[PDB]
């Protein structure tokens, strides 16, 4: 397997100006300064960049890259994308199930995983967790070997890496590079980028490529680089690392001078001649959904702090609310306390639904990498990740709150009222979470999304129906009350609760009102707030909440779909 | 100036086991792996560590370190502590005013600053901002030269640095090291720690010190290190950096190398030489003035944070005025008045969360300047309160009051206006003080923000709107005295409802026809548990003031007992 590029020129200012080279089986490399388009070149050859800005031709054994090339090959990221909660074996099973064909029996996939583990020397750490903030973790070298394992499952002939040594120790880096050189012996082409390596690293190489300001300063066997620079009019003193020597030359101990020198060299002649010689889904939907949901549930259970803390906090809050509001009385203060407690419940759901921002934001890089590589579609990711995390964690707290408080406070003792309260709280939670997802999807910054959600909720509570009476609001501003989730939830709860209540002892305002200003029934309170007494006035809030849910989830899916994967 | 240490042994597990060495004028260095106590050793010699865990003696020209040594010497941190907003010259003036003596005329201090700028090659960037998130910044090399400038003001004979090259480019690092070698020629002792340098770096050195697991693997002139290792039974191939050679040797034993070095002649000579050797600055007002000046400059030079809040408060006032425009004396007047006042109070409480960021962000700078003798804790605390906290909390309350009071149609009297303003101001100050107390002496912002949010949420329940305070059980009602929103909301209600009638055609004040009407403000107040006497208005303010005092005292104490090391 040989990868050949000819007259690469990529512009967005051009990160690459003019580049020629070929890469044959072995431990090819790419060096240079940070701004030097080594990373850009690696992305270009791997096809993780926008084809439009490209201006040259790329070939493989004389054949252009097909459209399934990205899926076939392998690309290893600088920052590991593994799931810290899961075990090595579980991650490899995930990759094998999604990337490989479904026809193959699970036994063959397990055999492949075991083979990979044997090759990478992971037998002992097959079943140990990778590590997280709350979980104990294996060494970085094991992390990197795992990340490489996820890519060899499909047995790629070409393999790409981005700064494999960066973020590691010297001995670990050397061990990883020795492992890669072991792999290359089998007949795989390997391509990677390094930053200021050591001499053993620079010796392990078989081919070399050097860049600066998008300019090919050199290309050819690694050993001949020093000789070429010496013949160019530079001298390297002993105990000086050749790579650092090159970088110092680039810095100034100019660029066009070096590029012209290389163009005049024999290596460029041979490369150009060779180039001119050369020129003349995988799986179903249910499978992806099942495996994505399984992984998300494993991660959820393997991070108990986040979920269990919220559950415990909701239990404590229910107990406190029950204690404060214990024994609601049918007197003047009953209206105030009922309205307050229902408002608090609704707003607590809305504000606690801010955690959904962290859902898609955190796993953005993994999502992109797995979508490009052909693991799954966007639909499966979205739906499975909703079905796994969002659903249960929003459903449980509402049930807990309802069960705890309903009987302690002494709300209407009927099954229908109980279940309506539960259902309304559930819908409010789902709607707020969907809003959060829509705001936060396709982002990497959590702060801005949290701020936006907080501001929106704050402006929503004003129109809830407690602080300001909705009838009094001017007509040119009242229409905004239909963009409030707390309004709908609070209205439904009030309707379900006040409809059969009397708040004046000794007086029958329902039959006839002696004094025009008393507010001695629930119906008077409702009508004074702008609420209807018909059942439709209870369920239209629910249908509105459902429509909001649908709209927000559709928006989130669209925001994921049109996100730039490159 | 010679710094000599003998049988250093520091334990907290010992980061240093047994170390001997001397450092003479020149470009001394300290190398090793990350866990190797190079940073710990540098802190020990600089005296930025707890003396109790120390177990050896440290001398300077044969004399032990005095207690004013930390102030006299200089220490440069890995992460620059400069004020990005301010200019180079302003930072140097700050350091000169605080560190140097007050007797000296400002002209001499300006002369010293100009001399330092000339030495460091900063003449061109004297008056350009260092840089921040919103402001354009100078190169990292200029940052580091500035950081060094703040330390040479007092003309130290000894100078310490921690990873000066880390976080820089190769050429910039080489330039900085060449600058340091230029300085050493004048007669200053310099000590620093590096991580895997390059060969030119390793050649610039005059003395070398190597460490691993708290073990002195080598000490002596840098050139002789390679010869010593060669004579020990190791060989270095060409094109291999000597420092990387040492580190590879360490990686692959430790006790073997330590014993080898003990057997060497360098250890003999060092031990012999050691055994031969053995046998506030400023007033208070000045610190307060300069700290406040710096904080105000930084505040003005970060317009986004303040101006955004001011604009947001203006917008919120306009929106509130629009929604609640024209409050009516009918059944809905009570509801709307209570709601708007509750919203104002809670908005102040929740917007006062930004105060968490105040002391948390500048913790490292505060520690470094307190150790070095710039200022006391009192001056820092009071000046930083007087500069940032005061105006930014005072303005929004005035804006809210002016905008909404007349739009809504609250009581048209001057006294009510000013009471509303004063109450909102006190609420804001009290919540900010609470935030400072929670967040002082911390480096993590998230936990403090969460705690403040939770406390405010539990405070609003007892405010006096969601739950009537009379109904609450006696074994739980006492908690209502730990609420700031309660006091503010009660004061506002008292100031507003006291002269209102909410039923048209009816005089409940004189006599109530129906026992359940709520046709006056007094009935609403009494039903909520509020007193009608003036004392029932001002006791809330005195309680808020007491909270302010308590919280600020707690914050000062939390700063005072913070571990500076």
């Amino acid at each position, epitope marked *: 397997a040989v990868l050949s590029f000819h007259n690469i020129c990529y512009r967005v200012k051009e990160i690459l100006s003019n580049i020629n080279g070929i890469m044959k089986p072995g431990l090819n490399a790419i060096l240079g300064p940070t701004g030097g388009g080594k990373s850009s070149l690696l992305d270009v050859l791997a096809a993780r960049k926008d084809p439009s800005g490209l201006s040259g031709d790329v070939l493989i054994n004389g054949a252009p890259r097909p459209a399934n090339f990205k899926c076939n090959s392998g690309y290893v990221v600088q920052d590991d994308v593994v799931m810290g909660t899961l075990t090595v074996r579980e991650n490899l099973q995930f990759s094998a199930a999604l990337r490989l064909a479904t026809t193959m029996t699970n036994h063959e996939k397990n055999e492949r995983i075991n083979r990979v583990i044997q090759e990478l020397g992971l037998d002992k750490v097959a079943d140990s967790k990778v590590g997280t903030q709350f979980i104990r973790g294996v060494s970085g070298g094991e992390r990197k070997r795992t990340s490489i394992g996820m890519e060899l499952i499909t047995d790629p002939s070409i393999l790409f890496l981005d700064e494999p040594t960066t973020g590691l120790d010297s001995s670990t880096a050397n061990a990883v590079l020795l492992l890669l050189k072991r792999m290359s012996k089998q007949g795989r082409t390997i391509i990677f980028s390094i930053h200021q390596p050591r001499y053993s690293i620079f010796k392990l190489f078989d081919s070399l490529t050097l860049l600066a300001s998008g300019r090919l300063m050199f290309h050819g066997p690694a050993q001949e680089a020093l000789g070429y620079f010496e013949s160019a009019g530079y001298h390297c003193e002993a105990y000086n690392n050749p790579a650092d020597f090159f970088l110092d030359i680039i810095n100034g101990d100019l660029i066009e001078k070096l590029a012209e020198i290389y163009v005049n060299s024999s290596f460029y002649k041979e490369t150009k001649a060779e180039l001119h010689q050369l020129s003349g889904y995988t799986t179903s939907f249910c499978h992806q959904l099942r495996w994505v949901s399984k992984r998300s549930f494993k991660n959820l259970l393997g991070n108990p702090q986040a979920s269990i803390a919220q559950i415990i906090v909701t239990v404590v809050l229910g107990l406190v609310i029950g204690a404060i509001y214990f024994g609601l009385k049918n007197d003047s203060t009953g209206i105030q306390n009922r309205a307050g407690v229902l408002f608090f419940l609704t707003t607590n759901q809305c504000f606690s639904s801010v955690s959904a921002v962290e859902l898609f934001v955190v796993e953005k890089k993994l999502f992109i990498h797995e979508y490009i590589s052909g693991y799954y579609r966007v639909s499966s990711y979205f739906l499975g990740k909703l079905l796994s995390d969002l659903l249960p964690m929003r459903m449980l707290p509402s049930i807990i709150f309802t069960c705890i408080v309903y009987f302690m406070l002494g709300l209407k003792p009927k099954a229908d009222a109980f279940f309506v309260m539960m259902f309304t709280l559930m819908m409010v939670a789902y709607s707020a979470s969907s809003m959060a997802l829509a705001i936060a999807a396709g982002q990497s910054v959590v702060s801005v999304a949290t701020l936006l959600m907080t501001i929106c909720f704050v402006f929503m509570m004003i129109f809830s129906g407690l602080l300001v009476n909705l009838t009094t609001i001017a007509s040119w501003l009242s229409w905004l009350q239909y963009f409030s989730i707390p309004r709908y939830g609070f209205t439904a709860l009030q309707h379900n609760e006040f409809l059969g209540q009397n708040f004046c002892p000794g007086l029958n305002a329902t039959g*006839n*009102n002696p004094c025009n*200003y008393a507010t001695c029934t629930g119906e*008077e309170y409702l*009508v004074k707030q702008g609420i209807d007494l018909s059942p439709w006035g209870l369920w239209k809030n629910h249908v509105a909440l459902a429509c909001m849910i649908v709209i927000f989830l559709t928006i989130a899916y669209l925001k994921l779909l049109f996100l730039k994967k490159y | 100036a010679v710094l000599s240490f003998h049988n250093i042994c520091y334990r907290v597990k010992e980061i240093l086991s047994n170390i001997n060495g001397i450092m003479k004028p020149g470009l001394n260095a300290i190398l090793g792996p990350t866990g190797g106590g190079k940073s710990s050793l540098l802190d020990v010699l600089a005296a930025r560590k707890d003396p109790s865990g120390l177990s050896g003696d440290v001398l300077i020209n044969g004399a032990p370190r005095p207690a004013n040594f930390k102030c006299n010497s200089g220490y440069v941190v890995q992460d620059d502590v400069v004020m990005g907003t301010l200019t180079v010259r302003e930072n140097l003036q700050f350091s000169a005013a605080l560190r140097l003596a007050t007797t000296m005329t400002n002209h001499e201090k300006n002369e010293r600053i100009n001399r330092v700028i000339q030495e460091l090659g900063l003449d061109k960037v004297a008056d350009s901002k260092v840089g921040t998130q919103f402001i354009r910044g100078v190169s990292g090399g200029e940052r580091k030269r500035t950081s060094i400038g703040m330390e040479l003001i007092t003309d130290p004979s000894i100078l310490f640095l921690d990873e000066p090259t880390t976080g820089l480019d190769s050429s910039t690092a080489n330039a900085v090291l060449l600058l340091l070698k230029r300085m050493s020629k004048q007669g200053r002792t310099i000590i620093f720690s590096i991580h895997q340098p390059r060969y030119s770096i390793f050649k610039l050195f005059d003395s070398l010190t190597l460490l691993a697991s708290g073990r002195l693997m080598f000490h002596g002139p840098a050139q002789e290190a390679l010869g010593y290792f060669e004579s020990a039974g190791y060989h270095c191939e060409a094109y291999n950096n000597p420092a990387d050679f040492f580190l590879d040797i360490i990686n692959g034993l430790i006790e073997k190398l330590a014993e080898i070095y003990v057997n060497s002649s360098f250890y003999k000579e060092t031990k012999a030489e050691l055994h031969q050797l053995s046998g506030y600055t400023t007033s208070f007002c000045h610190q307060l003035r300069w700290v406040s000046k710096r904080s105000f400059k930084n505040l003005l030079g970060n317009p986004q944070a303040s101006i955004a809040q001011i604009i947001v408060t203006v917008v919120l006032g306009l929106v509130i005025g629009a929604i609640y425009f024209g409050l009516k*004396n009918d059944s809905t007047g009570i509801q709307n008045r209570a709601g708007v006042l509750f919203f104002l109070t809670t908005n102040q409480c929740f917007s006062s969360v930004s105060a968490v960021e105040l002391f948390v962000v500048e913790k490292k700078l505060f520690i470094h300047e307190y150790i070095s003798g710039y200022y006391r804790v009192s001056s820092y605390f009071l000046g930083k309160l007087l500069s940032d906290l005061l105006p930014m909390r005072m303005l929004p309350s005035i804006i809210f009051t002016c905008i909404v009071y007349f739009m809504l149609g609250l009581k048209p009297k001057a006294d009510a206006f000013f009471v509303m303003m004063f109450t909102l101001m006190m609420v804001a100050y009290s919540a900010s003080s609470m935030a400072l107390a929670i967040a002082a002496g911390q480096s993590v912002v998230s936990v403090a923000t969460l705690l403040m949010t939770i406390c405010f949420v539990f405070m609003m329940i007892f405010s006096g709107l969601l739950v009537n305070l009379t109904t609450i059980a006696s074994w739980l009602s006492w908690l209502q005295y730990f609420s700031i929103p309660r006091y503010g909301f009660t004061a506002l209600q008292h100031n507003e409802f006291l002269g209102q009638n909410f039923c*048209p055609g009816l005089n409940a004040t004189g006599n109530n026809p129906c026992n359940y009407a709520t046709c006056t403000g007094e009935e609403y107040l009494v039903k909520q548990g509020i007193d009608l006497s003036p004392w029932g208005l001002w006791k809330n303010h005195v309680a808020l003031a007491c909270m302010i005092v308590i919280f600020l005292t707690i914050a000062y104490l939390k700063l005072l007992f913070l571990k500076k090391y």
Partner: antibody
Framework: VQLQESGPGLVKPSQSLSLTCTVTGFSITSDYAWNWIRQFPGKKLEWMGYINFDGGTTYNPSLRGRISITRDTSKNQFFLQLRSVTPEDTATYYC????????????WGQGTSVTVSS | DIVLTQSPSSFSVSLGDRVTISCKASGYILNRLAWYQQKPGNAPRLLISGATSLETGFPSRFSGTGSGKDYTLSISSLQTEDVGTYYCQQYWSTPWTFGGGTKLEIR
């Protein structure tokens, strides 16, 4: 408790309108609310506004700024000022009373006609 | 606002007969409904408050009934003196609205 309207029986278009109701048997600053009501030809009652016992007032939105109601507590009078008159607002005008505890208009006046022509 | 509707703008009955009159509201009124009786060339006179109560000065031949939006007035065995124009008023919301009128006649 005993009311009596008074005022011009004829007005020019888009000039003004002013009426007066004198109360006997009660002080208008004591308990009640005092309304103004009109009945167009082709009987269609309309409510215009009131002034409470504390000086507060409330008006019908359909009359946007054309109407203002005042009082003179010296002799127990409350007035009507309807400006920018049109021939459409020719009708019979009444002064009435509104308790508030009961809610209804108990006591009325005899009514005075008003003609807007030229 | 709240607009009140009286479907029978006119009626036609004889003495001893029983006649029923109705008012429909656009919103919930909660028995804040009143009925006024107007003879020609006279001011309206209050007749019923609260949709059921009767004012002193009238016989116990007038009755009121209704809940929510639908209210009716019942005149059982009307005499001659009961001929005239009747109105329904709502005093729930500040822009008080009357009905259009229901003129009785005689056959």
């Amino acid at each position: 408790v005993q009311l009596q309207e008074s005022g011009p029986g004829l007005v020019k278009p888009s000039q003004s309108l002013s009426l007066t109701c004198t109360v006997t048997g009660f002080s208008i600053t004591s308990d009640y609310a005092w309304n103004w009501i009109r009945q167009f030809p082709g009987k269609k009652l309309e409510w215009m506004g009131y002034i409470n016992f504390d000086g507060g007032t409330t008006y019908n939105p359909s009359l946007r700024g054309r109407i203002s109601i005042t009082r003179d507590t010296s002799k127990n009078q409350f007035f009507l000022q309807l400006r920018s008159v049109t021939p459409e607002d020719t009708a019979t005008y009444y002064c009435a009373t509104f308790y508030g505890a009961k809610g209804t208009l108990d006591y009325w006046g005899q009514g005075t006609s008003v003609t807007v022509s030229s | 606002d709240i607009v009140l509707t009286q479907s029978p703008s006119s009626f036609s009955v004889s003495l001893g007969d029983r006649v029923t009159i109705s008012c429909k509201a656009s919103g919930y009124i909660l028995n804040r409904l009143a009925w006024y009786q107007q003879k020609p060339g006279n001011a309206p006179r209050l007749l019923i408050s609260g949709a059921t109560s009767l004012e002193t000065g009238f016989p116990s031949r007038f009755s009121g009934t209704g809940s929510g939006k639908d209210y009716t007035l019942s005149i059982s065995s009307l005499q001659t003196e009961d001929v005239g124009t009747y109105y329904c008023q709502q005093y729930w919301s500040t822009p008080w609205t009357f009905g259009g009128g229901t003129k009785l006649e005689i056959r």
